[PDB]
Design a protein around this ligand. Structure first.
Ligand code: EMC
Ligand code: EMC
Ligand code: EMC
Ligand code: EMC
Ligand SMILES: [Fe+2]
Ligand SMILES: [Fe+2]
Ligand SMILES: [Fe+2]
Ligand SMILES: [Fe+2]
Lengths: 352, 352, 352, 352
């Protein structure tokens, strides 16, 4: 697939909250470590593997207005590009809206366009060696390890957008026209009482992936609850890749992670019928509540293991995923996740 | 009611569209005349009575980005205030987000904050005589009458906001906190198959009024259909005051106005039951499809006459109102409006 | 004479000083009254007749930086123009360097270019009729008379520029090229020990006149002394037109004005020789030290009456002039002014 | 000596011209090589040893207005500091005037204040390895040697400021107050008909040195000539250090350098009388026109070898210097330089 913006994956995710001390604990429970402090702003860098999470507590700024609206949330998203000048000019030619971010003496002039819910989308062409943006804009803490391993999360795998009815098409067009993303798959998920629809959008770099979710015709489901609780469209869950989910599970549990309620025993009993010869240790999945899906087509096994945290920032939750030959998404996991969140809505008295 | 910003009424409404030549004919059909052109931008002043409508076709600006998103629409609103510097500074202390608008040589530096759907909310303290803002920022057309009467519309009476489920509270708070509006009345309107809920918000000047509308629990109605068609929250209808609605209705009709479908004969038959001694010429109302409402309490009659155009700007429609003692809104008129739009939904095949 | 920029006279002169309370007393001793205070800045409006003098005590601004360098001085100058947008854009196409001035809510965006010594040159197209720039940017003092008469000064007649050797040509070019001024007359003035050279530059409106002064080959004179005491090129004296100089002289005297030392009695004895039939009351001139000059060509008498204060603002001095048919300058008066300042040098010990 | 600004030497010098292709040849004759091109502006990097010379040909900027006024010249100067935030803040607290420079996406925000004649003075704290400003803001040419040796010029030694009469004190205070420079020496140089006065200011880092030059009482000399031809105050000559002047002379000669007329034979005949035991090969210096000075105090020899280029950019000339134990300036060399420029004045017909 052609890549006109020269997209080379996710660079960083940015966070903001109206209440001081609410994001720090979250990041620590998820295995992240504070590693540097911006040189003139009140913004901090948290890291795990190659994941860069930016904590922005800058007063009177884009981030502080965004957090007064949405609560604790993802307030920015940066993609890596080959050439920021070229990619920023191309996006303005194609109709994107520019966002100006102020900087101090000797800091970089990072370009950005408006994205989901007003959150900036940054186009960064300075990464990896020599000097990354963090080497120039930030000051590393005295003595800290600058590349912590944490609980094994490596890179950002994918993130979702929960959108109002009729806007799945709008956000598909945004990423199709500006970045040449493509609809890799379409889902129609039904729970016991409610349901949803989704389009899994993939970027041409084969790294950035963004599932776009919208409520069903019925209404009363989890997508509509998100939209009310977040006060608009936004990133509903962020997913981190790991090379070994059970091991990561054990490490997150030790430090305070809170996962979703596991599926019933029935689910684990039907795995072999559904995925003949998967090969995974059912005993270890079922003890942890891990979901298993993918295909088994004449010897060729492509699997997907997924597990979700409870909501931790307003309505936003996180996901720890391990791919074994499957580069897409799976309908059974999606359905399990969906039934889990629907039971919680009954539990809480908000549905039927 | 206390007025801490020193509000003094609406100053102007601003409109944009992505296709050139779509707004001119709508203004012309409502009785407005073009009277001036801005001195450096591609923006035009349309007037009737004391109503000032600004047509903004300035390329690569706030208004062009807003119209690419929403279609023909209301992209800006200005309020009259006693001292712009004090009101602007008090907004900014109470959390409002400032919006910067570029200006050329010798033009006014108009202050604004972000409002409904991102549309700027201006805070103007130079009006009336001596020089208004149109005297300084616009050049009147050679020989045109600078104060046209048109079809009789006088001032902007009110305008609505159609919001997403759960956001009526959000917008009520925005106006209560920054300007001290108050909820003057609550409505719960039910059609044949659908319904809505609304809060009529009143500013402390007794001039600015903004009903806030949201869809019912059942969904599928007209508010949800506006949100999808508009691509977000926005001003659903703008109402203009007239001192004589049957005369304004005849004027409007001559120059092409397209009004909604009238109520059935049954409605006009029940008027005397419901409003004993109203004193209005039923024969005139009924042939035009005008709606009559208010109260008849012990000889004190406080009436409201309303009529609505078809949708003219995407899903946005306009209202022509005459007040005869009633300063608020009427439930019976709200119902008939709602039932009429509901029947149109059924006719277009979008409802049940 | 063609007028491409639409010049229409002087609009205002701006002053600054590094010591608080040094300019106030000098304005009051020349007949000016404070009449308004800016709406957001620490800047005050001083007025007499149609002369507007702006006292700028704005901290951390162009004016504060300029006064730190030069001492009490003229830091700005504004010209009236027909259309600011056209004039400003023509200036920028002919190489003029733009100067941005910040402004608060609802204030005018005044365009300016760099002029003598970096002092901004404003281009104002809003004067007289309806609302001036003082009506929009300033708040008049409770109950003070908005148009005071003072001591009879009416308008700014002219103002000089003292320049470095070789820069008369440079400043003549600047005004010729941008506004089409012309060299109306050239002077070569010699004292007892020193001398100077000067180009009287005239604008195409018949109102703005700027004499440009430079030191002679000999050096050690009064222009060189100004340039060291002022710390650069700048406006050396500002002249105010009056319709009656002996009356203004009496008024100025009563409020504290200090005038230069008078010419010796010889001067007044030779007036008839030099200007047969001048017709002026020699007895009144001689008792006040007024200078008289011009021509007497076969009946046609074009006279000039001039008087100069002592230096009041570092090396800057002021002039009170009455024109009786002569629209230019006089060589005899220039010489007497020169000889008087030369004797002052000798008196202070700085010359020979 | 205390160093409050944390000064650590010169970082770069910047040049502009109104005529294209006038600076490229000058740099090439002086042994410099073009090594990179800015990533978004029309600015180019030239290098020799640790010397970085920036060629700024960016339209409608500070540089293009500065060049229209002064002709080919030094338009910018950058010092190295430990912390640009701290140094920039300290300089604004002490009265310096800020200068804003526009930058593109992912470029550094370089801070600067106003210096000699308006030319910016940059405060850069990013140098040496990791990434210098050139690694971030520029794009190295494909295949070129990034660190060329040229003719041996190592670093910038010093540079002068020619100032108007009475401004030696002004510029002395500027550097004393902001950066704590000190007057290391004072010269009073007389030629045959004219003379000058000078203060050698030294920075506390013992690297930055700036001799300040002003015309004598007599007038008509070479400083006054510079001021007219440059159209104001500015950098009259820039000096480059070399470890071997005779070998640098030979390589400069080869590629096109034009040196001043050497001193008469008489001057070399007297060297031994004035500097007993200097030890330098007089044959090699006299054939090349190199100037020799310093001291010979009981065995301890501190020498200075200097040679000057003809004027190459308007009235600006260059110096190639070798220090042999003398960290200051020499009065004989200054006098010989002065006599040489004076004779050229007589040759050209501008003096007596
Ligand atoms: C600076 C936008 Hg989170
Ligand atoms: C520029 C606001 Hg429609
Ligand atoms: C702000 C010009 Hg004196
Ligand atoms: C870009 C200033 Hg010479
Ligand atoms: Fe996911
Ligand atoms: Fe209405
Ligand atoms: Fe004068
Ligand atoms: Fe030198």
């Amino acid at each position: 697939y052609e890549n006109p913006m020269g997209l080379m994956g996710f660079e960083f995710i940015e966070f903001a909250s109206p209440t001081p001390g609410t994001l720090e604990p979250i990041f620590e429970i998820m295995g992240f470590t504070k590693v540097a402090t911006h040189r003139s702003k009140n913004v901090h860098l948290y890291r795990q593997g190659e994941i860069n999470l930016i904590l922005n507590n800058e007063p009177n700024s884009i981030a502080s207005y965004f957090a007064a609206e949405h609560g604790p949330s993802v307030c920015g998203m940066a993609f890596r590009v080959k050439d920021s000048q070229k990619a920023y000019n191309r996006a303005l030619e194609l109709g994107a809206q520019p966002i100006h971010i102020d900087t101090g003496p000797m800091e970089l002039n990072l370009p950005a366009i408006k994205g989901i819910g007003g959150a900036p989308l940054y186009l960064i062409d300075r990464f990896g060696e020599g000097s990354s943006i963090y080497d120039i804009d930030f000051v590393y803490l005295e003595g800290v390890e600058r590349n912590p391993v944490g609980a094994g999360l490596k890179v950002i795998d994918h993130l979702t957008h929960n959108v109002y009815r009729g806007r799945m098409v709008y956000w598909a067009n945004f990423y199709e026209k500006l970045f040449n993303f493509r609809e890799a798959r379409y889902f129609d998920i039904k729970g016991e009482y409610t349901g949803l629809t989704s389009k899994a959008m993939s970027a041409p770099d084969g790294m950035i992936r963004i599932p776009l979710n919208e409520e069903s015709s019925k209404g009363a489901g989890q997508i509509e609850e998100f939209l009310m609780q977040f006060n608009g469209e936004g990133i509903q869950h962020v997913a981190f890749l790991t090379d070994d989910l059970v091991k990561t599970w054990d490490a997150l549990k030790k430090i305070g992670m809170r996962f979703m309620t596991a599926p019933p025993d029935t689910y684990y009993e039907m795995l072999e019928g559904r995925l003949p010869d998967h090969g995974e240790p059912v005993d270890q999945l079922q003890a942890r509540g891990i979901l298993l899906d993918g295909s088994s087509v004449e010897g060729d096994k492509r699997l997907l293991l997924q597990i979700f945290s409870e909501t931790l920032m307003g309505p936003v939750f996180f996901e720890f995923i391990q791919r074994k030959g499957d580069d897409g998404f799976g309908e059974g996991n999606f359905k399990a996740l969906f039934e889990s969140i629907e039971r919680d809505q009954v539990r809480r008295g908000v549905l039927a």
